[PDB]
Amino acid sequence: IKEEHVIIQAEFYLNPDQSGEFMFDFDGDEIFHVDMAKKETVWRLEEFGRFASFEAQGALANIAVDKANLEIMTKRSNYTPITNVPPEVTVLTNSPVELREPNVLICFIDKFTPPVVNVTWLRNGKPVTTGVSETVFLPREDHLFRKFHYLPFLPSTEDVYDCRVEHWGLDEPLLKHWEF
Amino acid sequence: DTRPRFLEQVKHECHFFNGTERVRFLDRYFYHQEEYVRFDSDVGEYRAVTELGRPDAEYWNSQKDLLEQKRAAVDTYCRHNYGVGESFTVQRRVYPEVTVYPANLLVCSVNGFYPGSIEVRWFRNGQEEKTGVVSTGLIQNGDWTFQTLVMLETVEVYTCQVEHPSLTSPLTVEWRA
């Protein structure tokens, strides 16, 4: 047969942002990523931390090497930069929506590079932030990225929503709508 | 931003077959999105994927210690991490919440399950439905949870049945009006 499982340790460094990422993937899901600032292992599901540990210090050892390699590759490609690939934004809910029953609006930003994006949730045109969360830049097999944004909400026939996505591969900020 | 971007990407991949009977390890480097060098455990040495990776391929290959570590990776990295995660990743099993509701189109929403392997079937009067059934496919919610939606074009008890690893028996939700 074929592969049943695949664990991927993905990491990236981006110039001129001077930002990097270090994560672990398991069949599409993020096990954990390392918060470079706090030098802390952030598990996707807190429960994971009750069973495993990771030396976050290790992550930065990789990123340093990647920064060094980037410089080498940048000089070696004759400073050929990245071609912006615009995101495919889709908005769905966590479970079927019913008025007054708690749900989550998921904004799925897919197939893009570089890994820099600006996502903002709008409710009736105004930005919303209460309880919002986002994943980290998740890798794709075609070496582009994925990202998930969450907005816990209470379904009503009153409000409409918008996932506003900004990416240099786009001309004007992308807006993906959602209404009951 | 006017400034052009330069991205460096590195992926250490572990592919498991039959538990951990077979394991395959890759160490891939990507210029922007283009892989230039890779270590394949089945090759045992760094291979330049594109001519850009040649210096690295030759240089890294001349390192007995680096090659030793990568050659050991299938056991020390892959099989080890598989063991550490095994219980909360490979073994993770979350049961689906099924909901049948009218959109005559009938929608069967199967939500919050892990792993993705699932079977959703529509039955009308105890007989399965093939034609008129539409699926949304597996949807990863990005939180170790999946969702799937199966619509049935309806002309009578309609039962949405779900088979998932986390269950000993199928989940049936029977609907009438």
Partner: peptide, 12 residues
């Protein structure tokens, strides 16, 4: 139990 990181090869 601990997850291990594979080192990134340094270039030339």
């Amino acid at each position: 139990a601990y997850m291990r990181a594979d080192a990134a090869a340094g270039g030339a």
